[PDB]
């Protein structure tokens, strides 16, 4: 199966003579509050020989056993700190479909190369020491790490509506009514500036003979050319530890599994950060629902999440910072409909309308039937 | 007879139909010519919203009738 | 493409407007438009005027604009904040659509509310059960707020 082949690849990769950890131990002390600052102070000065030794992480004034758990918690905190959009290093592809990608505005900093080399070193350290981050990038990011060609379909993972518009342009003919031409307007800190896809491109309208080149240039500029220097620095930092001959045995999904592990949806967070309309927290159609979500496989939970909210990807901080169509909108459970009808979903408001059933088995059957057409993960 | 429909993109589409032809047949012809699924079609004829299972004569549709294709409402 | 298209739309609106709706930039900012919709005469909202705010994303026309109501409207498919995400603005958007098509779609929505999209479940239930009460409430709200 897929899993067995992936395990064989992982064993072969970690059995390479160029990815063997040394016996000497390296200490690494970081305060819990200032994790980002201390992590950048220490990691951005370690040598490549030093980073290959055993990693032993001890939080300040928090002494205990099971250093493995401490290291895992440290990597979790660091991954949720550096990849946080509020730090202006990465950004969600869309606010209603949370997918991390390199932020074009990050070039405003005087020296983004040091920070992105630090990010690359962090990712290489996570892969090297069998520790998992918990961020979820977009597939084009992974396809860029492995140096794969990027085509139009890759825009589907980044932004759905943009891909639909591009496919519309590809299929249907374009007239002169549309004022489309080889130029992209980007609003950087209030002021909007024009970038020419081709030289003297702002004065060349797209006819039926140019729209293919226009789509190619738009896809390349949206996915690659906007983030050249930053991703070059990041990949240099990553390849400092992991040779490119090792990463190029995986694909855009096996690499994701290697970085972030087997993805799962937390249920405790889901229950703690949901709200009800006409339903109380003690209502039977709520306790049965939460029991069902407790004893379910991750694929079916992801399918239900995509069916209700609209996408299978969650924000970087769980369901707390969840966005709807217009703004923050937590997962809502509502009493709307007749007994016979299946549960319904309003995606633009993250609402799930569950009628007042009479038994847990009927609820399970209706909810499993209603989500079949939705494919998650 | 012949009828005309104005789609979203400003393109006018001509359909060769009959007064006794059902709405389903017209939608099937539209799908064959354009690929638009019947379920996604929201046609307006002088403010009348067409429904499946009926005929053109049910909507007082006549020769060279002009319809618009407005989009679905979800809120 | 995000400014020439907007200028083209503004020029088209200024030549042959739909004779009911109007749209124009607020001050000098081409990416923020005010729109005015006349109350349709065949709907309970007749005799009223409604205001809309339209934000054009920098990815226009590839990404649909964000329109929001300002004046309150007792409608099953419009919430208190006035958010609208119907297919012409979230799902079925193509570069060929102009801003006049969105205004026409909204003015048609103001007369034919959806029956099975209970954005306000109480109002949707009233619409499905007691149409006369729903129309009376809509007219009362239009009298109170639209004027």
């Amino acid at each position: 199966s897929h899993m067995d082949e992936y395990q064989r690849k992982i064993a072969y990769m970690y059995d390479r003579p160029e990815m063997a950890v040394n016996d000497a131990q390296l200490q690494l002390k970081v305060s819990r509050a200032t994790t980002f600052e201390d992590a950048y102070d220490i990691i951005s000065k370690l040598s490549v020989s030093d980073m290959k030794k055993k990693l032993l992480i001890r939080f300040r004034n928090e002494d205990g056993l099971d250093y493995g758990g401490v290291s895992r918690e440290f990597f979790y905190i660091l991954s949720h700190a550096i990849f946080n959009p509020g730090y202006s290093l990465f950004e969600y592809a869309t606010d209603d479909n949370y997918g991390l990608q390199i932020s074009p505005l990050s070039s405003v900093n005087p020296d983004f190369r040091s920070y992105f080399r630090f990010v690359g070193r962090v990712m290489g350290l996570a892969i090297y020491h069998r520790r998992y981050l918990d961020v979820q990038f977009v597939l084009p990011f992974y396809k860029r790490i492995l140096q794969k060609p990027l085509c139009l379909e890759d825009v589907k993972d980044v932004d759905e509506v943009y891909y639909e518009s591009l496919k519309w342009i590809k299929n249907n003919d374009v007239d002169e009514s549309l004022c489309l031409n080889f130029s992209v307007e980007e609003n950087r800190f209030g002021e909007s500036v024009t970038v020419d896809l081709i030289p003297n491109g702002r004065n060349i309208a797209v006819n039926n003979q140019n729209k293919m080149n226009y789509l190619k240039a738009l896809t390349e500029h949206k996915l690659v050319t906007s983030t050249e220097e930053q991703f070059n620095a990041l990949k240099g930092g990553l390849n400092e530890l992991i040779p490119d001959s090792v990463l190029q045995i995986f694909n855009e999904n096996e690499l994701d599994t290697l970085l972030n592990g087997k993805r799962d949806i937390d249920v405790q967070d889901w229950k703690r950060f949901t709200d009800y309309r006409s339903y109380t927290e003690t209502d039977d159609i709520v306790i049965w629902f939460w029991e069902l979500l407790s004893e379910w496989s991750p694929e079916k939970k992801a399918k239900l999440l995509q069916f209700a909210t609209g996408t299978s990807r969650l924000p970087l901080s769980g369901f707390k910072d969840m966005h709807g169509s217009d703004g923050p909108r937590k997962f809502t459970i509502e009493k709307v409909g007749h007994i016979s009808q299946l549960p319904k979903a309003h995606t633009c408001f993250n609402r799930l309308d569950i009628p007042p059933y009479n038994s847990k088995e009927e609820l399970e059957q209706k909810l499993t039937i209603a989500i079949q057409e939705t494919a998650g993960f | 007879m012949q009828i005309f429909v104005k789609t979203l993109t400003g393109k006018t589409i001509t359909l060769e139909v009959e007064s006794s032809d059902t709405i389903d047949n017209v939608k099937s012809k539209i799908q064959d010519k354009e690929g638009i699924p019947p379920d996604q079609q929201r046609l307006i004829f002088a403010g009348k919203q067409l429904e499946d299972g009926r005929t053109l004569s049910d909507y007082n549709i006549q020769k060279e009738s002009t319809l618009h294709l407005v989009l679905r409402l979800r809120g | 493409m995000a400014l020439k298209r907007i200028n083209r739309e503004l020029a088209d609106l200024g030549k042959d407007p739909p004779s009911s709706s109007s749209a124009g930039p607020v001050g000098d900012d081409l990416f923020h438009w005010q729109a005015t919709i006349m109350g349709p005469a065949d709907s309970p909202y007749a005799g009223g005027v409604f205001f809309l705010s339209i934000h054009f994303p920098t990815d226009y026309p590839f990404k649909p604009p964000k329109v929001n109501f300002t004046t309150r409207i007792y409608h099953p498919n419009i919430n208190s904040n006035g958010s609208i995400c119907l297919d012409i603005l979230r799902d079925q958007w193509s570069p060929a659509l102009t801003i006049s098509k969105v205004l026409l779609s909204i003015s048609s929505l103001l007369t034919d509310p959806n029956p099975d999209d209970p954005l306000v479940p109480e109002i949707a239930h009233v619409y499905k059960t007691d149409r006369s009460r729903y129309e009376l409430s809509a007219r009362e709200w239009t009298r109170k707020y639209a004027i």
Side-chain angles (χ1 to χ4, degrees):
Chain A
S1 300
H2 165 269
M3 183 54 60
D4 192 12
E5 181 72 11
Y6 170 75
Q7 292 295 335
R8 162 186 165 268
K9 282 179 180 177
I10 290 305
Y12 171 63
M13 164 186 178
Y14 284 113
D15 204 7
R16 288 298 303 271
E18 62 195 10
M19 288 196 59
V21 297
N22 292 26
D23 305 5
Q25 294 187 4
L26 162 71
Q27 68 173 1
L28 168 50
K29 289 185 54 182
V30 284
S31 298
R32 181 176 296 265
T34 72
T35 307
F36 193 7
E37 288 82 24
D38 293 322
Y40 173 76
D41 168 56
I42 304 294
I43 279 186
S44 184
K45 298 184 180 303
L46 296 178
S47 55
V48 186
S49 178
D50 282 11
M51 285 185 305
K52 291 183 176 179
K53 296 187 287 187
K54 284 193 185 63
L55 209 70
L56 193 56
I57 305 156
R58 317 162 195 170
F59 279 93
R60 176 161 288 99
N61 297 127
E62 304 178 19
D63 306 333
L65 303 182
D66 55 278
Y67 284 104
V70 181
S71 63
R72 290 183 168 275
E73 184 180 348
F74 162 80
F75 270 112
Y76 192 84
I77 292 181
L78 196 47
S79 64
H80 280 11
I82 64 182
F83 299 110
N84 194 258
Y87 281 87
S88 176
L89 285 190
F90 289 69
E91 66 166 5
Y92 293 151
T94 38
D95 289 359
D96 37 326
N97 296 321
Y98 330 90
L100 288 179
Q101 63 176 346
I102 305 187
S103 181
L105 311 176
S106 53
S107 177
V108 70
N109 286 327
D111 49 338
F112 46 83
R113 288 144 191 161
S114 300
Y115 298 99
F116 277 99
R117 189 171 62 93
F118 160 74
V119 176
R121 275 173 182 249
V122 154
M123 293 199 313
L125 220 56
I127 296 186
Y128 198 102
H129 285 100
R130 317 175 76 96
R131 296 286 171 247
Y132 304 104
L133 314 175
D134 214 10
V135 296
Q136 185 171 10
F137 302 104
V138 292
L139 270 308
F141 186 79
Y142 297 134
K143 300 183 71 175
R144 288 180 72 190
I145 282 189
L146 313 172
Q147 293 180 186
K148 291 190 189 308
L150 291 180
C151 46
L152 174 55
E153 293 77 9
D154 302 310
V155 193
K156 179 178 177 58
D157 305 312
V158 178
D159 200 356
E160 281 282 351
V161 191
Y162 209 110
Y163 171 59
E164 296 300 332
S165 302
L166 295 180
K167 189 171 61 180
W168 184 100
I169 290 196
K170 182 165 61 63
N171 289 327
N172 313 21
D173 67 331
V174 179
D175 307 329
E176 55 186 352
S177 302
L178 299 82
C179 292
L180 294 170
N181 54 344
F182 293 93
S183 81
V184 285
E185 298 289 341
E186 44 174 22
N187 199 92
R188 302 179 61 175
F189 303 101
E191 54 179 1
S192 304
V193 77
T194 308
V195 187
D196 318 5
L197 304 188
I198 65 177
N200 194 252
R202 56 172 53 87
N203 313 128
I204 298 182
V206 285
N207 307 279
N208 305 282
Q209 290 76 13
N210 291 9
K211 61 171 176 294
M212 286 306 179
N213 296 12
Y214 181 60
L215 295 180
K216 170 187 304 180
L218 251 182
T219 306
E220 172 178 339
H221 165 90
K222 174 181 173 55
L223 295 178
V224 178
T225 314
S226 51
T227 68
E228 264 188 334
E229 312 283 345
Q230 313 156 47
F231 187 88
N232 280 344
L234 180 149
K235 185 178 171 51
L238 168 57
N239 283 135
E240 202 168 14
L241 302 90
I242 306 169
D244 201 5
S245 59
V246 163
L247 288 178
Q248 284 194 353
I249 68 184
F250 295 95
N251 57 81
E252 50 274 7
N253 297 320
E254 290 174 343
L255 181 63
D256 186 18
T257 294
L258 175 54
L259 264 171
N260 315 136
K262 186 183 183 306
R263 186 155 287 100
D264 193 341
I265 298 184
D266 208 3
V267 183
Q268 283 295 334
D269 189 16
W270 200 347
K271 172 162 55 181
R272 184 162 55 250
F273 285 81
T274 193
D275 50 1
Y276 318 94
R277 297 187 175 190
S278 174
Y279 261 146
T280 58
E281 306 165 7
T282 174
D283 218 329
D284 301 2
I285 317 295
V286 173
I287 58 178
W288 293 341
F289 179 72
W290 291 126
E291 292 186 12
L292 291 186
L293 274 195
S294 291
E295 46 206 345
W296 259 8
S297 59
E299 276 85 32
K300 204 145 72 173
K301 288 192 295 184
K303 284 162 65 178
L304 168 63
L305 182 72
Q306 179 169 354
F307 155 76
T309 74
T311 186
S312 62
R313 287 197 288 254
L314 287 180
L316 208 63
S317 55
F319 296 88
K320 177 182 189 61
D321 301 317
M322 204 172 194
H323 279 258
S325 67
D326 56 349
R329 208 60 172 173
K330 298 192 297 185
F331 190 86
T332 310
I333 293 178
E334 203 160 12
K335 174 190 291 183
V336 164
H338 198 260
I339 291 184
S340 59
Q341 303 169 346
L342 311 185
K344 301 188 178 305
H346 314 329
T347 63
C348 62
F349 284 100
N350 300 10
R351 276 166 50 182
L352 180 66
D353 309 0
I354 308 181
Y357 294 109
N358 287 15
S359 181
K360 188 177 67 179
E361 293 76 6
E362 191 165 355
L363 170 59
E364 176 188 10
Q365 293 169 3
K366 301 297 182 183
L367 202 46
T368 51
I369 287 183
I371 64 187
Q372 294 292 66
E373 78 271 335
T374 300
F377 287 168
Chain B
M1 65 179 181
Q2 184 176 186
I3 58 176
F4 299 93
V5 181
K6 291 182 175 58
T7 50
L8 310 172
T9 68
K11 177 184 179 181
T12 301
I13 306 174
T14 189
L15 311 164
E16 176 66 26
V17 291
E18 299 293 336
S19 301
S20 61
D21 286 339
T22 64
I23 299 295
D24 300 331
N25 179 266
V26 182
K27 290 190 173 185
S28 180
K29 285 184 172 58
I30 291 181
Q31 183 181 3
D32 295 330
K33 294 182 179 180
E34 323 297 334
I36 309 176
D39 307 0
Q40 307 174 0
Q41 296 175 12
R42 186 177 172 88
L43 291 177
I44 289 190
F45 168 60
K48 289 181 174 298
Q49 176 177 338
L50 307 188
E51 306 172 1
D52 295 72
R54 296 173 56 178
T55 68
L56 304 175
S57 57
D58 299 331
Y59 296 93
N60 307 328
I61 297 180
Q62 58 183 359
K63 314 299 181 180
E64 279 71 38
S65 297
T66 295
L67 332 173
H68 293 198
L69 177 54
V70 297
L71 283 189
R72 308 269 288 186
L73 19 68
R74 261 69 205 279
Chain C
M1 70 177 188
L3 201 70
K4 192 178 174 184
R5 174 62 172 275
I6 289 184
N7 287 334
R8 172 63 58 90
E9 285 185 7
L10 214 166
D12 280 2
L13 284 186
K15 289 180 180 180
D16 181 72
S19 301
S20 63
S21 171
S22 171
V26 183
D28 290 328
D29 195 10
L30 267 53
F31 289 80
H32 181 73
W33 279 20
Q34 65 155 1
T36 56
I37 294 186
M38 293 283 294
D42 49 76
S43 55
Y45 314 100
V49 184
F50 293 74
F51 296 96
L52 279 71
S53 66
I54 309 182
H55 296 96
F56 293 119
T58 54
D59 304 315
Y60 197 72
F62 296 109
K63 293 190 71 65
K66 297 179 54 60
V67 316
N68 286 324
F69 261 93
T70 291
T71 309
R72 308 185 63 182
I73 164 182
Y74 188 93
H75 195 264
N77 286 253
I78 292 182
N79 309 95
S80 61
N81 46 325
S83 305
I84 315 181
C85 91
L86 80 167
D87 284 9
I88 200 188
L89 290 166
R90 167 187 171 271
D91 185 69
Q92 296 170 328
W93 175 263
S94 57
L97 293 178
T98 57
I99 210 59
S100 180
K101 187 67 174 184
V102 174
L103 292 162
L104 261 53
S105 179
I106 293 185
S107 184
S108 169
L109 175 67
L110 258 54
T111 82
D112 309 328
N114 175 283
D116 288 353
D117 280 64
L119 289 198
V120 197
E122 164 201 5
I123 300 179
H125 173 256
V126 171
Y127 182 82
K128 292 180 59 61
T129 55
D130 195 357
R131 183 68 69 90
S132 63
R133 183 55 181 175
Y134 156 83
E135 293 193 4
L136 177 58
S137 297
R139 278 214 286 267
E140 292 295 330
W141 278 56
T142 297
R143 180 182 298 101
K144 184 185 301 179
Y145 299 109
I147 303 298

